[PDB]
Amino acid sequence: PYRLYVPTTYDGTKAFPLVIALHGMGGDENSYFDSYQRGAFMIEAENRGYIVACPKGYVGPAERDVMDVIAEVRRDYKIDPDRIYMTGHSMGGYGTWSIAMNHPDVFAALAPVAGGGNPLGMANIAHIPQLVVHGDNDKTVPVERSRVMVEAAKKHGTEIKYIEIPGGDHVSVAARTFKDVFDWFDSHKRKRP
Amino acid sequence: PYRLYVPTTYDGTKAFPLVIALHGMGGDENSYFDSYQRGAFMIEAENRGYIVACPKGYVGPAERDVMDVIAEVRRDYKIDPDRIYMTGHSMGGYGTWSIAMNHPDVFAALAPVAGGGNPLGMANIAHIPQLVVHGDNDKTVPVERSRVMVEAAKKHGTEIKYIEIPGGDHVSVAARTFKDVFDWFDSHKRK
Q: Using CB atoms within 10 A as the burial measure, which of B2, B35, B149, B163 is most buried?
């Protein structure tokens, strides 16, 4: 199961960009609607014209679930193949990186928030521009989990912007940076070098 | 991969109890050894006589991994099959419940800390005595995620103890309740 946001401006005549938003460990397919400053994420999607899909939560069958949600949405809606994005918080930040590493050719840009992953996989996704957000006082996922990924990214010439928030904790950083995430997706389309 | 603690009282003549301890999202097989009040878990294990295995991180073949850790340890060490326990924090709290639901006849008792899961799965494990710990000011995993599991456990006649820590946050509650987790395991064996 997943939740879908469709902007008022979508009429099926023009391809739209798609954002896949992955919830945290406590959350579900409603989290980006109902929480994160009471659905702030969908204000950005409506303002800027993104279809958003929020899968229920990211390795193995969970990953395949996400890709299956993408494929169904791309069947049902006119989606621009060069404008498919992924962001997520906490467990979803881990998922953003791990899914993209397994499916490096799909996503135009990524924004993991308060996540982490396998720094040795960053070469796989060096062609994908990434916005990384982490708080430096996060007690759930140490800030070093994002720092090591950003460091590795740079060793392969990735286009990367890292917002490390002084005093940021695990949860505060997510809704705070929704604007930065959509700004990043607005300014990047998929590279197929 | 996993990392093992073996008490200095283990001489291979006597079966020992085994605890599987599952880390959180950021962690690895070293977490319970180096973190959580600098390895306080292993001081308990030394004092009380438990072998402890800490898998490296829990769905799918990330799950089969735990039976495999238990199996490898049982190859190498004399483990009492009626005294195999599991605990874990945060992502590991989720794992404690999801792994036991998939292997309901293995564990003598469980202790998920700051976790959650699928309350419908609680029927599967109602025969397993469970200690649940959660802080009521947890901002990563709402305290409601434990409360719903405890409610579900009671539907199915589970032996369950719930420690809700007033003012508790996502992290503090783990090391603060290691004594409780070991007391729960000390007092329950697989029937």
A: B149
Tell me how far apart the alpha carbons of residues B162 and A43 are, in angstroms, rounded to a whole number.
39
Domains present along chain A, CATH in parentheses: 1-193 (3.40.50.1820)
CA quadruple A10, A12, A16, A20: dihedral, nearest 10: 90
Resolution expressed in Å: 1.5
The Cα B155–Cα B170 span in angstroms is 27
* Cβ-nearest to A25 among B61, B94, B171: B94
Q: Is B25 within 8 Å of A139 when comparing Cβ atoms? A: no
How many angstroms separate the CA atoms of A86 and B86, rounded? 34
Lookup result for tokens 């993104």: A50
Instruction: Check CB contact of A64 with chain B, cutoff 8 Å.
Output: no
Q: According to the entry, how was the structure determined?
A: X-ray
